[PDB]
Amino acid sequence: MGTSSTDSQQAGHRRCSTSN
């Protein structure tokens, strides 16, 4: 709940190494 511009992709691709 909260992925305006960071879905499972952007979040699970080019995101921090701690689910920031």
mmCIF file of N, CA and C in Angstrom:
data_model
loop_
_atom_site.group_PDB
_atom_site.id
_atom_site.type_symbol
_atom_site.label_atom_id
_atom_site.label_comp_id
_atom_site.label_asym_id
_atom_site.label_seq_id
_atom_site.Cartn_x
_atom_site.Cartn_y
_atom_site.Cartn_z
ATOM 1 N N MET A 1 0.827 -1.201 0.000
ATOM 2 C CA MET A 1 0.000 0.000 0.000
ATOM 3 C C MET A 1 0.865 1.256 0.000
ATOM 4 N N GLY A 2 1.158 1.767 -1.193
ATOM 5 C CA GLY A 2 1.976 2.961 -1.307
ATOM 6 C C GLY A 2 3.003 2.855 -2.415
ATOM 7 N N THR A 3 2.530 2.763 -3.654
ATOM 8 C CA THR A 3 3.416 2.654 -4.806
ATOM 9 C C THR A 3 2.966 3.572 -5.936
ATOM 10 N N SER A 4 3.105 4.876 -5.724
ATOM 11 C CA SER A 4 2.709 5.860 -6.724
ATOM 12 C C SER A 4 3.617 5.786 -7.948
ATOM 13 N N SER A 5 4.916 5.640 -7.705
ATOM 14 C CA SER A 5 5.892 5.559 -8.785
ATOM 15 C C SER A 5 6.996 4.564 -8.447
ATOM 16 N N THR A 6 6.668 3.588 -7.605
ATOM 17 C CA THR A 6 7.630 2.572 -7.199
ATOM 18 C C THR A 6 6.935 1.256 -6.870
ATOM 19 N N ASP A 7 6.500 0.547 -7.906
ATOM 20 C CA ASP A 7 5.820 -0.731 -7.725
ATOM 21 C C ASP A 7 6.813 -1.827 -7.353
ATOM 22 N N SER A 8 6.346 -3.071 -7.367
ATOM 23 C CA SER A 8 7.192 -4.210 -7.024
ATOM 24 C C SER A 8 8.447 -4.234 -7.892
ATOM 25 N N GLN A 9 8.345 -3.656 -9.085
ATOM 26 C CA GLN A 9 9.471 -3.612 -10.010
ATOM 27 C C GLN A 9 10.507 -2.588 -9.559
ATOM 28 N N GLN A 10 10.173 -1.311 -9.706
ATOM 29 C CA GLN A 10 11.075 -0.234 -9.314
ATOM 30 C C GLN A 10 11.563 -0.427 -7.881
ATOM 31 N N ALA A 11 10.729 -1.056 -7.059
ATOM 32 C CA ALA A 11 11.076 -1.305 -5.665
ATOM 33 C C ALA A 11 11.921 -2.567 -5.525
ATOM 34 N N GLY A 12 11.690 -3.529 -6.415
ATOM 35 C CA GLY A 12 12.438 -4.772 -6.373
ATOM 36 C C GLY A 12 13.458 -4.874 -7.490
ATOM 37 N N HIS A 13 13.954 -3.726 -7.941
ATOM 38 C CA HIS A 13 14.943 -3.689 -9.013
ATOM 39 C C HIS A 13 16.055 -2.695 -8.694
ATOM 40 N N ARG A 14 15.734 -1.408 -8.778
ATOM 41 C CA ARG A 14 16.706 -0.358 -8.500
ATOM 42 C C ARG A 14 16.378 0.355 -7.192
ATOM 43 N N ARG A 15 16.197 -0.422 -6.129
ATOM 44 C CA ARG A 15 15.877 0.135 -4.821
ATOM 45 C C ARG A 15 16.953 -0.222 -3.800
ATOM 46 N N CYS A 16 16.909 0.436 -2.646
ATOM 47 C CA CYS A 16 17.880 0.190 -1.588
ATOM 48 C C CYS A 16 17.968 -1.298 -1.265
ATOM 49 N N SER A 17 18.969 -1.669 -0.475
ATOM 50 C CA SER A 17 19.168 -3.063 -0.095
ATOM 51 C C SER A 17 18.538 -3.352 1.264
ATOM 52 N N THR A 18 17.511 -2.581 1.609
ATOM 53 C CA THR A 18 16.822 -2.752 2.881
ATOM 54 C C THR A 18 15.352 -2.357 2.767
ATOM 55 N N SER A 19 14.816 -2.437 1.553
ATOM 56 C CA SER A 19 13.422 -2.085 1.310
ATOM 57 C C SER A 19 13.111 -0.692 1.848
ATOM 58 N N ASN A 20 14.051 0.229 1.663
ATOM 59 C CA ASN A 20 13.880 1.601 2.130
ATOM 60 C C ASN A 20 12.578 2.196 1.601
#
